[PDB]
């Protein structure tokens, strides 16, 4: 995205790296204080735009915990299904862009076609491709379109071949390995003490998944 | 004469193309508003220069193969390539090819 | 009618490099499950003309403080060398029949680096100067192995004349006699023109682009002549011209394929690649190709 | 349950070492990647021919706003100001007064389309289905001021898109 | 589909067709329907100069056969 | 094989009313596909479908050359489609 | 007369050349950049219109502002716009760039990118779909086609 990086080097090697942030500081947390909970829900779509539905689920769970209520089972199953869809969307974007920065740039298009299909699913379920605001603090906004589940099954039965193509282009390539192997090695203790979570933990051998 | 004319034509075509490229958008009015000195670059340049000199020594090889002194010519060519390899090995072992 | 021959050598090369952009765009698009330009022109054909016209009508960003002399000189040298390197090539009859055609090619290729040096120097930016220094280092490092591989291959031809390369490959291609040197030559030519995976780096910009694309096409044609020897019957040279053009096109499309297939190296990674894998093997194979004709009594004729 | 992704050990016998050396010296996986890209070249692209072809949409799609009216031709909006109260972006401005016949109608109804976040909260807070978010999305503009809609513009949008808007509402109102 | 790339490639090929072919034809036109004489090593040049001297029209490509032996 | 695809291309040339229509459609829409005519529009737009194409290419519109006040042989845009054909074309419904 | 005919045809040619190859540099500030990359995806294929992907600032014709412009970022965007050669165009994408959008009443957000740079096309939506951004690009192409410079020079 947008980023400023002030770094000191001694020749080729990086000596110090200080990142400057705040170029996308909009003041969301202060704006939330002037809205009701429903009005404050759409901000979480905009927080982490790559995976919009996951952000809303977190907020909805917090509000449900504070309200002492629980969603019905079908709402929970829909939320988990769309959370996994959003994880697919997030991972495709993350892996492809990372590869694109390195210079691969073909799997970006290959997998953004699938991303377009998942955006079609988002639009069918909510009417919005990205900033859906589908997951509410009482469940979900609306029931699924009569034909949505069959299309989701049709999409998800062909995705393994796409992942296989990505792996064939990237996994065993010697240039990709030389670019990625032994880069940014972090120990388990340093990862835990620095506040890391997710893959950044699991990449170091720490067995943790919420 | 032919080669000089060809080079002259190439230079003239490039110069004319650059001049029109620089002066076609200059006729219309517009708004019209350090120290580091990395050593390894110098070292790789010097290594290139030395290897270039040894390549210059190696160049007459295609004509060197018709001499009736095939043993001596083969020995001298192999000696030159062995010395090139020895220079490369010395630069490799003494950490001259690092970053 | 020599001037007509010079013009008929120059202008078609410029047209070919103008449409190579279209070919690259369409090829990359179709390897990316999309299309290339297909709106401008019936099949996207009029895209290069629109690109050129737009580039030549756009305001040029002179640095306003740098050396104007070198700012103008660098594209002149680049394009002049790019057009000059085409004259010794026999297709099947060269425009200029040099005795030492290979050495003249090597000299022009070595000259091609002053354009990078002067452009980086006249950029008036420390970061661009650093990038230019890296580019020049890569260029010189790889032309070392280019020259060594070239002499090793030519040891089987008997001279530096490119016309004799057709006679050498009358029966069999040179790819069979030395495929490892051919693979190393292909990678070195990729690294010479700053093409992926070695692509670490208005008007004058377009002219630099034309110089690079002409260099790419010329390098692929040189590879086709050196390693894929077409058959030339003296009573109909159009057959040789057809074969040579087809092979050059295949090699250029292979360049586009390679660009679309791989990620790019780091600077130290490709430096190490050259200096620790190509140079030792290049020296070993140079010794082998010196020894082989004497061992097998197969020394080429001319002296 | 956990899985190991990179916990393999290469075999050190002569055949496997020779295979790895052949891969190094002949670039087998590089040709594999080349071949996959080549195979990808020879299949149909996924590009549609816009603007002559359009991407798929759904009745729930939220695009340009519109104000609807009853089949008699009377506007549905009754100035309840629920859409204005629920608007997360404060993009709706409403002023009302009794009409000549005593009806409860708005005299000012503006939507700032440069403030709107297109969440559709206004059309689900409306109790009379007056304000809706139509299916039009190709309404780009050359100036900022034309994106500041008033009551006349929204009423014109409703009169312009009523057929398609009503069809979409008919298709999707049973899910609401 | 993929064959939509063929037109531009074709054009490119046509361009690469022009230079070499042109050279050949010019070498036929300026040498009396024969290939341009290759003159390395200074002996072929001597032969060409002798042909030019004995041609009678100051053109090396005008070959003189037994009909000129009288 | 090759013969079948060249024959299909010849039929595509034939199905646009000759060479003139083929060139007109090629230079107006950058596409020369032939499909069953589904609808005619009161402004002149024509709407075709082809269910054997993949989703997104199975429906299309050839725009009229003259809308309310402007010549539209070249300057076309997606905002010209009337709302009902807008619904059918965007696959919000299966019924023209 | 022929004098105005020549400049009219030259205008047509130059306008066709300029609009048939638009090289955009995109300010991927926020979530609207995602819809830009989807407009660059295989389905819509901006490159097929002559609109290349991620041009350099020194060789870009059109600037696409896709995201929220914050007070900390405005000078950088203005500098990048000033570095751009002429003729240059700006497209404002999304509510955040058009007028601030969801963060309009914020202490650290510029209320519209047109406080900093002039804007040619405003693409509405939060975010606009890839089809919407493509429509905006084609509208900018039509706007470029409408313009007339040699004629203005000739009658002045
Ligand atoms: C040999 C000497 C060279 C010197 C420099 C000369 C430059 C090269 C000359 C070649 C120019 C090529 C022109 C081809 C343009 C035709 C494109 C045509 O199709 O445009 C259409 C017609 O529009 C315009 O009428 C075309 C104007 C083109 C120029 C008009 C005549 C200019 C000729 C003057 C040449 C003399 C030059 C003298 C000084 C150099 C509109 O299409 P467009 O809107 O895009 O796209 C819509 C997309 N749709 C259709 C899919 C929906
Ligand atoms: C493979 C083929 C590709 C082709 C390669 C490129 C070939 C280039 C072809 C040139 C096409 C003609 C270019 C003409 C456009 C020049 C730029 C332009 O638009 O001029 C506008 C400009 C407007 O100025 P103002 O309104 O006063 O500015 C006030 C604002 N401060 O008008 C001019 O000054 C133009 C000057 C008169 C031009 C008319 C004479 C004809 C020129 C023919 C081309 C000449 C060069 C060749
Ligand atoms: C630029 C390159 C300049 C020289 C290119 C030509 C080199 C060459 O090898 O050809 C010389 C050519 C052919 O040689 P052979 O192959 O041996 O065949 C002859 C037997 N029939 O014969 C000649 O010597 C004629 C040319 C000599 C006169 C002109 C020499 C060139 C002078 C260049 C001056 C310009 C230099 C400016 C600075 C350069 C900085 C980049
Ligand atoms: C009995 C007498 C025989 C005489 C001797 C013959 C011996 C022959 C057997 C050995 C020769 C093989 C050598 C050929 C070249 C080897 C170079 C090489 O292997 O380098 C690789 C690296 O090479 C590359 O990675 C280059 C890849 C560049 C990317 C582009 C891919 C190119 C592949 C596409 C097809 C290539 C087409 C080649 C032929 C074209 C002809 C026109 C090693 O690097 P790393 O794996 O990183 O490890 C080094 C640190 N330990
Ligand atoms: S869609 Fe949301 S932001 Fe837009 S006017 Fe309606 S309530 Fe306000
Ligand atoms: S919610 Fe409906 S009826 Fe109430 S003010 Fe808004 S548009 Fe009018
Ligand atoms: S304009 Fe809308 S979609 Fe785009 S970044 Fe801003 S809030 Fe997100």
Chain A residues near residue G65 by CB distance under 8 angstroms: none
Q: Name the nearest CA neighbour of D120 among A38, G19, C256.
A: A38
Query: Under CATH, which architecture does the G2-155 domain have?
Result: 3-Layer(aba) Sandwich (3.40)
Asked if G122 and D147 count as a contact pair (C-beta separation under 8 A), the reply is yes
Asked if A133 and A42 count as a contact pair (C-beta separation under 8 A), the reply is yes
How far F5 CA sits from the closest chain G CA (Å)?
A: 24
Mutate to test the pocket of ligand 3, among C77, C80, C97, C99 (most ligand atoms within 8 A of CB): C99
Instruction: Give D65's DSSP letter.
Output: E
Would residue B35 count as lying in a domain?
yes
* Atom of ligand 2 at shortest range from CA of B24: 46
CB within 8 Å: C261 and D47: no
Spatial distance between the Cα atoms of C97 and C89, rounded to a whole number of angstroms:
9
Q: How far is CA B74 from CA C32, C284, C294, in A?
A: 52, 14, 8
Spatial distance between the Cα atoms of C300 and C157, rounded to a whole number of angstroms:
6
Helix or strand run (H / E) with residue C222: helix C203-227
Spatial distance between the Cα atoms of A73 and F6, rounded to a whole number of angstroms:
57
Spatial distance between the Cα atoms of A48 and A63, rounded to a whole number of angstroms:
19
Considering only CA atoms, give the Rg of chain A. 20
Alpha-helical segments (H) within chain A: 28-32, 37-40, 42-47, 52-67, 73-102, 106-126, 148-156, 159-170, 174-180, 188-193, 199-202
CB within 8 Å: A12 and B36: no
- CA E29-E33-E35 angle, 5° bins: 90
Residue A6 backbone class (left: φ over 0; alpha: ψ -120 to 50; beta: rest): beta
Q: How many Å lie between the centroid of ligand 2 and the Cα of residue G5? A: 14
Spatial distance between the Cα atoms of C31 and C26, rounded to a whole number of angstroms:
9
Spatial distance between the Cα atoms of D29 and D19, rounded to a whole number of angstroms:
12
Neighbours of chain F (3+ CB pairs under 8 A): C, D, G
Q: CA G18: distance to chain centroid? A: 13
Structure tokens at C75: 């594209």
Helix or strand run (H / E) with residue C267: helix C267-273
Residue that the structure tokens 């600077």 belong to: C267
Would residue B88 count as lying in a domain?
yes
Q: Which residues contact C251 (CB under 8 A, 6 or more apart)?
A: C220, C221, C223, C224
Q: CA B67: distance to chain centroid? A: 30
Helix G130-146 to helix G2-20 angle (10° resolution) is 160
Q: Which residues contact F36 (CB under 8 A, 6 or more apart)?
A: F48, F49, F50
Chain G residues near residue D121 by CB distance under 8 angstroms: none
Q: What dihedral do alpha carbons C77, C82, C83, C85 form, nearest 10°?
A: 110
Spatial distance between the Cα atoms of C208 and C17, rounded to a whole number of angstroms:
12
Asked if E15 and C221 count as a contact pair (C-beta separation under 8 A), the reply is no
| G127 prior amide bond cis, ω within 30 | yes
Mutate to test the pocket of ligand 2, among C49, C56, C202 (most ligand atoms within 8 A of CB): C56
Would residue B99 count as lying in a domain?
no
Window G:100-139, CB contacts with D under 8 Å: 100-102, 104-105, 112, 114, 119-126, 128-132, 134-136, 138-139
Spatial distance between the Cα atoms of G100 and G93, rounded to a whole number of angstroms:
11
Buried b (16+ CB within 10 A) or exposed e, E27-55: beeeeeeeebeeeeeeeeeeeeeebeeee
Chain E residues near residue D44 by CB distance under 8 angstroms: 1
Q: Name the nearest CA neighbour of D162 among A129, F86, F43, F89.
A: F86
Q: Which of A105, A169, A175 has its CB closest to that of C265? A: A175
Instruction: Give D75's DSSP letter.
Output: B
SS (H, E, C) G25-71: EEEECCCHHHHHHHHCCCCCCHHHHCCCCCCCHHHCCEEEEECCCEC
Q: Which of B6, B62, B78 has its CB closest to that of C87? A: B6
| Size (chain F), residues | 96
Asked if C293 and B94 count as a contact pair (C-beta separation under 8 A), the reply is no
Q: Give the HSE-up count for residue G40: Cα atoms under 13 Å, Cβ half-sphere.
A: 19
How far A124 CA sits from the closest chain D CA (Å)?
A: 6
B99 touching chain A per CB within 8 A: yes
Asked if F54 and D44 count as a contact pair (C-beta separation under 8 A), the reply is yes
How far B21 CA sits from the closest chain C CA (Å)?
A: 5
Buried b (16+ CB within 10 A) or exposed e, D126-165: beebbbbbbbbbbbbbeebeebebebebbbebbebbbebb
Q: How many Å lie between the centroid of ligand 2 and the Cα of residue G58? A: 21
Spatial distance between the Cα atoms of C144 and C149, rounded to a whole number of angstroms:
9
**Phi, psi of F57, rounded to the nearest 5 degrees:** -110, 5
Asked if D62 and D118 count as a contact pair (C-beta separation under 8 A), the reply is yes
Q: Which of D34, D43, D47 has its CB closest to that of C257? A: D34
Would residue B43 count as lying in a domain?
yes
Q: Which residues contact G128 (CB under 8 A, 6 or more apart)?
A: D137, G32, G35, G93, G94, G136
Would residue B6 count as lying in a domain?
yes
**Phi, psi of D7, rounded to the nearest 5 degrees:** -120, 45
Method: cryo-EM
Determine whether the shortest distance from the Cβ of G68 to ligand 7 is under 6 A: yes
Q: What dihedral do alpha carbons C20, C23, C24, C29 form, nearest 10°?
A: 160
Which ligand sits nearest to residue D117's alpha carbon?
A: 5
Q: Which of C27, C33, C183 has its CB closest to that of D45? A: C33
Structure tokens at C84: 């000059």
Structure tokens at A123: 């639009």
Asked if F23 and F32 count as a contact pair (C-beta separation under 8 A), the reply is no
Q: Which of D50, D88, D142 has its CB closest to that of G131? A: D50
**Phi, psi of B95, rounded to the nearest 5 degrees:** 60, 35
Structure tokens at A137: 């603090």
Determine whether the shortest distance from the Cβ of C97 to ligand 3 is under 6 A: no
| Size (chain A), residues | 210
Determine whether the shortest distance from the Cβ of G98 to ligand 7 is under 6 A: no
Spatial distance between the Cα atoms of D24 and D17, rounded to a whole number of angstroms:
11
Q: Name the nearest CA neighbour of A32 among A46, A51, A48, A22.
A: A46
Spatial distance between the Cα atoms of E11 and E18, rounded to a whole number of angstroms:
11
Structure tokens at A31: 């704006």
CB pairs below 8 Å between C and G: how many?
68
Spatial distance between the Cα atoms of F48 and F34, rounded to a whole number of angstroms:
8
Asked if G97 and G68 count as a contact pair (C-beta separation under 8 A), the reply is yes
Q: Name the nearest CA neighbour of G84 among A200, C61, D71, A196.
A: C61
Spatial distance between the Cα atoms of G22 and B59, rounded to a whole number of angstroms:
50
Q: How far is CA C190 from CA C24, C153, C202, C215, E14, in A?
A: 15, 18, 26, 11, 25
How far B37 CA sits from the closest chain A CA (Å)?
A: 8
Spatial distance between the Cα atoms of D161 and B18, rounded to a whole number of angstroms:
55
* Alpha carbon distance, N-terminus to C-terminus of chain D: 41
Structure tokens at E27: 């070498």
Structure tokens at B15: 């110069």
Beta bridge partners of C171: none
Stated resolution in angstroms = 2.9
Report yes or no on chains A and E touching (3+ CB pairs under 8 A).
no
How far C56 CA sits from the closest chain D CA (Å)?
A: 28
Instruction: Give F79's DSSP letter.
Output: G
Q: Which residues contact D170 (CB under 8 A, 6 or more apart)?
A: none
Chain E residues near residue D45 by CB distance under 8 angstroms: 1
CB within 8 Å: D30 and C262: yes
Q: DSSP letter string over chain B?
A: -HHHHHHHHHHHHHHHHHHHHHHTTTSS----------HHHHHHHHHHHHHHHHHHHHTTHHHHT-SS-HHHHHHHHHHHHHHHHHHHHHHHHTT-S--
Q: Which residues contact B72 (CB under 8 A, 6 or more apart)?
A: none
CATH number at residue B85: 1.20.58.1610
Structure tokens at C111: 């000259």
Window A:3-32, CB contacts with B under 8 Å: 11-12
CATH number at residue D132: 3.30.70.3270
Structure tokens at G44: 């819509």
Residue nearest to atom 18 of ligand 4 (CA): D25
Instruction: Give A68's DSSP letter.
Output: T
Q: Which of C35, C258, C260 has its CB closest to that of D47? A: C35
CB within 8 Å: D37 and C34: no
Spatial distance between the Cα atoms of A111 and A133, rounded to a whole number of angstroms:
24
Spatial distance between the Cα atoms of C293 and D12, rounded to a whole number of angstroms:
39
Residue that the structure tokens 């090139």 belong to: B84
Q: DSSP letter string over chain E?
A: -GGGGHHHHHHHHHHHHHHHHHHHHHHHHTTTSSPPPP--TTHHHHHHHHHHHHHSSS-TTS---GGG--
**Phi, psi of C21, rounded to the nearest 5 degrees:** -60, -45
State how many domains chain B has: 1
How far G101 CA sits from the closest chain C CA (Å)?
A: 34
Q: DSSP letter string over C66-85?
A: S-HHHHHHHHHHHHHHHHHT
Determine whether the shortest distance from the Cβ of G126 to ligand 1 is under 6 A: no
Q: Give the HSE-up count for residue B46: Cα atoms under 13 Å, Cβ half-sphere.
A: 9
Spatial distance between the Cα atoms of D115 and D105, rounded to a whole number of angstroms:
24
Residue nearest to atom 8 of ligand 6 (CA): D77
Asked if A41 and A133 count as a contact pair (C-beta separation under 8 A), the reply is yes
Instruction: Give C196's DSSP letter.
Output: T
**Chain B residue at shortest CA distance from G153:** B28
Q: Which residues contact C281 (CB under 8 A, 6 or more apart)?
A: C180, C184
Residue B80 structural domain: 1-94
Chain G residues near residue D147 by CB distance under 8 angstroms: 98-99, 122, 124
**Phi, psi of G80, rounded to the nearest 5 degrees:** -65, -40
Burial class for C275, CB neighbours closer than 10 Å (0-12, 13-18, 19+)? buried
């Amino acid at each position: 995205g947008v980023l400023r990086l002030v770094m000191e080097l001694s020749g080729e090697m990086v000596r110090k790296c200080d990142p400057h942030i705040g170029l996308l500081h909009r003041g969301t947390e202060k704006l939330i204080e002037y809205k009701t909970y429903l009005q404050a829900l759409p901000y979480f779509d905009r927080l982490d735009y790559v995976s919009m539905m996951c952000n809303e689920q977190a907020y909805s769970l917090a509000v449900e915990k504070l309200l002492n209520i629980q969603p019905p089972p079908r709402a929970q199953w829909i939320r988990v299904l769309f959370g996994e869809i959003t994880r697919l969307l997030n991972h495709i974007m993350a892996v492809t862009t990372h590869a694109l920065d390195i210079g691969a740039m073909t799997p970006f298009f290959w997998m953004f076609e699938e991303r377009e299909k998942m955006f079609e699913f988002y639009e069918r379920v909510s009417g919005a491709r990205m900033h859906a605001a589908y997951i509410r603090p009482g469940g979900v906004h609306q029931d699924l379109p009569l034909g949505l589940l069959d299309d989701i099954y049709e999409f998800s039965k062909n995705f393994s071949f796409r992942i296989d193509e990505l792996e064939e282009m990237l996994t065993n390539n010697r240039i990709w390995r030389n670019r990625t192997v032994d880069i940014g090695v972090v120990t388990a203790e340093d990862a835990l003490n620095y506040g890391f979570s997710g893959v950044m933990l699991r990449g170091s051998g720490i067995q943790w998944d919420l | 004469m032919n080669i000089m004319l060809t080079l002259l034509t190439n230079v003239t075509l490039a110069s004319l193309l650059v001049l029109i490229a620089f002066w076609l958008p200059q006729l219309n009015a517009y708004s019209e508003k350090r120290l580091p000195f990395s050593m390894k670059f110098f070292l790789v340049a010097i290594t290139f220069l030395l290897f270039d000199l040894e390549i210059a020594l190696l160049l007459p090889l295609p004509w060197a193969s018709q001499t009736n002194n095939l043993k001596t010519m083969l020995t001298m060519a192999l000696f030159l390539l062995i010395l090139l390899a020895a220079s490369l090995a010395y630069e490799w072992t003494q950490k001259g090819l690092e970053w | 009618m020599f001037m007509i021959n010079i013009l008929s050598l120059i202008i078609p090369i410029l047209l070919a490099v103008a449409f190579l952009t279209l070919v690259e765009r369409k090829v990359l698009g179709y390897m990316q499950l999309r299309k290339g330009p297909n709106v401008v022109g019936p099949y996207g054909l009029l895209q290069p003309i629109a690109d050129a016209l737009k580039l030549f009508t756009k305001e040029p960003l002179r640095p306003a403080t740098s050396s104007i002399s070198m700012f103008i000189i660098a594209p002149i040298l680049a394009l002049s060398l790019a057009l000059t390197m085409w004259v010794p090539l026999p297709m099947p009859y060269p425009l200029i029949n040099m005795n030492l055609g290979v050495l003249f090619m090597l000299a022009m290729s070595s000259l091609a680096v002053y354009s990078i040096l002067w452009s980086g120097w006249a950029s008036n930016s420390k970061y661009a100067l650093i990038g230019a220094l890296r580019a020049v280092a890569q260029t010189i490092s790889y032309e070392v192995t280019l020259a060594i591989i070239l002499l090793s291959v030519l040891l089987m031809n008997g001279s530096y004349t490119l016309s004799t390369l057709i006679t050498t490959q009358e029966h069999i291609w040179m790819i069979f006699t030395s495929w490892p040197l051919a693979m190393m030559w292909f990678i070195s030519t990729l690294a010479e023109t700053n093409r992926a995976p070695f692509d670490l780096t208005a008007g004058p910009f377009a002219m630099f682009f034309m110089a690079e694309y002409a260099n790419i096409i010329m390098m692929n044609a040189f590879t086709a002549i050196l390693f894929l020897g077409a058959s030339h019957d003296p009573h109909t040279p159009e057959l040789y011209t057809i074969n040579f053009v087809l092979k050059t096109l295949a090699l250029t499309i292979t360049f586009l394929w390679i660009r679309a297939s791989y990620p790019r190296f780091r600077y130290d990674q490709l430096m190490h690649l050259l200096w620790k894998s190509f140079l030792p093997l290049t020296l070993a194979l140079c010794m082998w190709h010196i020894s082989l004709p004497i061992m097998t009594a197969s020394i080429p004729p001319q002296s | 349950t956990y899985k190991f992704v990179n916990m393999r050990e290469p075999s050190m016998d002569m055949k496997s070492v020779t295979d790895r050396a052949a891969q190094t010296l002949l670039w087998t996986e590089l040709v594999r990647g080349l071949g996959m890209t080549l195979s990808y070249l020879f299949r149909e692209p996924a590009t549609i021919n816009y603007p002559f072809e359009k991407g798929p949409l759904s009745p729930r799609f939220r695009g340009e706003h519109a104000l609807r009216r009853y089949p008699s031709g009377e506007e549905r909006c009754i100035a309840c100001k629920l859409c204005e109260a629920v608007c997360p972006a404060q993009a709706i401005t409403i002023e009302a007064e009794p009409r000549a016949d005593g009806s409860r109608r708005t005299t000012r109804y503006d939507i700032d389309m440069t403030k709107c976040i297109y969440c559709g909260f206004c059309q689900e807070a409306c109790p009379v289905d007056a304000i809706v978010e139509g299916p039009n999305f190709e309404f780009s503009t050359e100036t900022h001021e034309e994106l500041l809609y008033n009551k006349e513009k929204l009423l014109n949008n409703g009169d312009k898109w009523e057929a398609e808007i009503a069809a979409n509402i008919q298709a999707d109102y049973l899910y609401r | 589909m993929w064959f939509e790339i063929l037109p531009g490639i074709a054009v490119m090929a046509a361009c690469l067709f022009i230079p070499g072919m042109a050279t050949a034809h010019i070498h036929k036109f300026t040498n009396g329907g024969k290939e341009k004489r290759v003159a390395h090593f200074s002996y072929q040049w001597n032969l060409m100069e002798r042909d030019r001297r004995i041609s009678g029209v100051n053109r090396y490509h005008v070959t003189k056969g037994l009909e000129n032996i009288d | 094989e090759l013969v079948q695809v060249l024959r299909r291309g010849l039929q595509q040339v034939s199905g646009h009313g000759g060479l003139r229509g083929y060139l007109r459609v090629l230079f107006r829409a950058n596409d020369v596909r032939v499909g069953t005519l589904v609808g005619e529009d009161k402004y002149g737009n024509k709407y075709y479908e082809d269910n054997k194409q993949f989703f997104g290419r199975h429906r299309w519109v050839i725009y009229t050359t003259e809308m309310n006040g402007r010549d539209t042989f070249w300057d076309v845009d997606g905002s010209m489609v009337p709302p009902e054909w807008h619904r059918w074309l965007h696959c919000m419904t299966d019924d023209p | 007369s022929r004098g105005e005919y020549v400049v009219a045809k030259l205008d047509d040619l130059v306008n066709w050349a300029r609009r048939s190859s638009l090289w955009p540099m995109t300010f991927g500030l926020a979530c609207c950049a995602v819809e830009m990359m989807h407009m660059a995806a295989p389905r819509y294929d901006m490159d097929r219109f002559g609109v290349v992907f991620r041009a350099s600032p020194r060789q870009s014709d059109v600037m696409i502002v896709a995201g929220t412009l914050t007070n900390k970022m405005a000078p950088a965007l203005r500098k990048v716009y000033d570095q751009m050669p002429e003729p240059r165009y700006v497209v404002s994408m999304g509510s955040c760039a058009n007028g601030g959008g969801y963060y309009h009443y914020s202490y650290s957000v510029v209320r519209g990118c047109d406080r900093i740079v002039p804007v040619d096309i405003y693409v509405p939506g939060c975010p606009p779909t890839a089809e919407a951004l493509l429509y905006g690009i084609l509208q900018l192409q039509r706007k470029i086609k409408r313009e007339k410079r040699l004629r203005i020079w000739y009658r002045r």
